[PDB]
Amino acid sequence: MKELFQKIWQNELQFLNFDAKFQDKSKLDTAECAIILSVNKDNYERYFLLKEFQELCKKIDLRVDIFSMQNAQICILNLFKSGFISKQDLLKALKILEKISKNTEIFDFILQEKVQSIDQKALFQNDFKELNTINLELQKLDENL
Amino acid sequence: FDRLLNQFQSYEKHLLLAYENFLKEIEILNHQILEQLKSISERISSEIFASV
Amino acid sequence: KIKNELYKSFEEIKMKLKDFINILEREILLFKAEFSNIQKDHIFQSDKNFSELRAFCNASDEYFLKDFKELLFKSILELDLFFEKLNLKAFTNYENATKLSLAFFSRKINESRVLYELDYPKKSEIYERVLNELNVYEFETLLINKPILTKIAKNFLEQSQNLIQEKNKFLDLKKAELQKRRAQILNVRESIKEDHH
Amino acid sequence: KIKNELYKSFEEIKMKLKDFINILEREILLFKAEFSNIQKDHIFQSDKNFSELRAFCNASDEYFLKDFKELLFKSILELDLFFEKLNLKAFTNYENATKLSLAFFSRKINESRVLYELDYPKKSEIYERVLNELNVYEFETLLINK
């Protein structure tokens, strides 16, 4: 997807590592992801000057520099592939944001992309039985608890 | 700046690690080249002998 | 086929050195990419400080990378020259070695013949002579006694370590600069916190 | 002496290329030195603009100089390889060329001799043979044709 980032960061594209080194995966929700993706090189100065956008990035633990924005976009897209958090609803959010940012490129890339294994309810059962095991271990070691 | 320094030291350590295998391979290549030379010389000596 | 094998081996060694340089390069360029654009968060954070940091990390290619590249290029040059020497004295001049040793043995044979008083070639002698013609004493010295490839590699490692040390000192300069400011701030803080005196 | 002369000539060519690179380098580095530190004059000038200029001109080594140096190094490598070829095929193998052509003419002389039955080297032939041994067709091609 280096061609995509070349398309959306025409000259300001930086030397960056295309992988989601995301450490939380829940750092930001889908609307926030769509906003971060809509920081195309033509809106980036306005976004960085917007107080609300600065608040948002401080909430997400971002800077307002070019490099961190692009790195966050990389991580968002790789989560969109691998951990597969977004749906067509992320595309919904980008269409909503098109009021400001006519970001057709990332829109199409998210549309036309082999998504991934989905795996939802198996993961739900796995996490729930993890929590059950933790509850049992807590019960092992007090009667009121 | 500390991060940059640590990255440099990490690169140094990686070089030190890899040079074990790298130097052993280079030694092996030295010996290979020598023995290829000697094999060529053996062939040429055999064929010089043939035409006596 | 032997010559092509050795050529591929030389290319492999060159590729390994190049890969080392590429590793370091990618790390350094990621550093530049991050800190050429780092911006201050909230006021009172000395805009000039951040600007200077950005400029420095921007030129960090010059600062940290090109010397390594030059060292790599020098090593590649030396490797290529050594391979050329091996090619042109041994793996191309085998025909000439054959002709020289063959004619020498012929002349020796005829010298033996011209003793018409009844008063001839061993294979070991032929092997030794062809070995000498193929320059295998010289290449024995360069491959075993004074290994050329090994010396090149060790030079690369030692010079890269020296370069890393130089870079470390250079960065310690920046850290001392920061230490100055830090000490000033701590002086002010201790003055404020010990004014109940 | 001939070999040393040619070596010095090769070094001279390399030095000329290096001097070209040095010219360009000195100009570029002076540009960097001036404009890595240019500071704004008046209240209404864009401090950020000047900061970005300073960073850009600071990286101007990367931007404008290193490619030229790489090209120079490649050229130097090619020159050195060519000189080594000339050395190892011609200006060191003159002894071997002598031995080869000498033994060849000796064997031809003896071949002429063994035609008994009441049935030798000309200088032009010897010159041509020694010329071929010194690879002077190859080096004529590399020095004049190509």
List of chain C residues whose C-beta atoms are within 8 Å of the C-beta of residue D99: 100, 103
Element (H, E) at D107: helix D94-114
Best of B24, B31, B34, B37 to mutate (most C CBs within 10 Å, chain C): B37
Look at C39 and A64 and tell me if their CB atoms are within 8 Å: yes
Distances (CA, A) of D97 to A8, D120, D142: 66, 20, 20
A18 in Cβ contact with A78 (< 8 Å) = yes
Name the minimum distance, in Å, from the CA of C108 to any CA of chain B.
12
Report the alpha-carbon distance of residue D101 to residue D84 in Å, rounded.
23
Element (H, E) at D116: none
Neighbour subunits, B (≥3 Cβ pairs < 8 A): C
Look at C153 and B23 and tell me if their CB atoms are within 8 Å: yes
DSSP collapsed to 3 states, chain C? CHHHHHHHHHHHHHHHHHHHHHHHHHHHHHHHHHHCCCCCCCCCCCHHHHHHHHHHHHCHHHHHCHHHHHHHHHHHHHHHHHHHHHHHHHHCCHHHHHHHHHHHHHHHHHHHHCCCCCCCCCHHHHHHHHHHHCCHHHHHHHHHHCCHHHHHHHHHHHHHHHHHHHHHHHHHHHHHHHHHHHHHHHHHHHHHHCCCC
Look at A65 and C38 and tell me if their CB atoms are within 8 Å: yes
Resolution in A: 3.7
**Interface check B17 vs C, CB under 8 A:** no
CA proximity to B45, closest of C46, C125, D28: C125
And the tokens for A108?
């199409």
And the tokens for B42?
């053996």
Name the minimum distance, in Å, from the CA of C47 to any CA of chain A.
14
Distances (CA, A) of D52 to B49, C45, C182, D133: 77, 18, 26, 64
Backbone interruptions in chain C following residues (C to N > 2.5 Å): 119
A38 C-beta neighbours (distance < 10 Å), count: 22
Look at B29 and C9 and tell me if their CB atoms are within 8 Å: yes
The DSSP result for B13-47, as a single string, is: HHHHHHHHHHHHHHHHHHHHHHHHHHHHHHHHHHH
Report the alpha-carbon distance of residue D54 to residue C182 in Å, rounded.
25
Report the alpha-carbon distance of residue C20 to residue C168 in Å, rounded.
19
Element (H, E) at A14: none
CA dihedral D3, D4, D8, D10 (to 10 degrees): 20
* Residue in this structure with the two tokens 């002086």, named with its chain if needed: C187
CA proximity to B5, closest of C152, C178, A75, C40: C178
Q: Which of residues 73-112 of A touch C (CB under 8 A)?
A: none
CA dihedral D132, D135, D138, D142 (to 10 degrees): -130
Report the alpha-carbon distance of residue D88 to residue D86 in Å, rounded.
6
Look at C130 and B49 and tell me if their CB atoms are within 8 Å: no
Look at C81 and D76 and tell me if their CB atoms are within 8 Å: no
List of chain C residues whose C-beta atoms are within 8 Å of the C-beta of residue B31: 143-144
DSSP collapsed to 3 states, A28-68? CCHHHHHHHHCCCCCCHHHHHHCHHHHHHHHHHCCCCCHHH
Name the minimum distance, in Å, from the CA of A50 to any CA of chain C.
14
CA proximity to C103, closest of D129, B38, B50, B48: B48
CA dihedral D100, D104, D107, D112 (to 10 degrees): -160
With CA atoms as reference, the chain C residue closest to D36 would be C55
CA proximity to C7, closest of C72, C93, C90: C90
Burial class (CB in 10 A: 0-12, 13-18, 19+), A68: buried
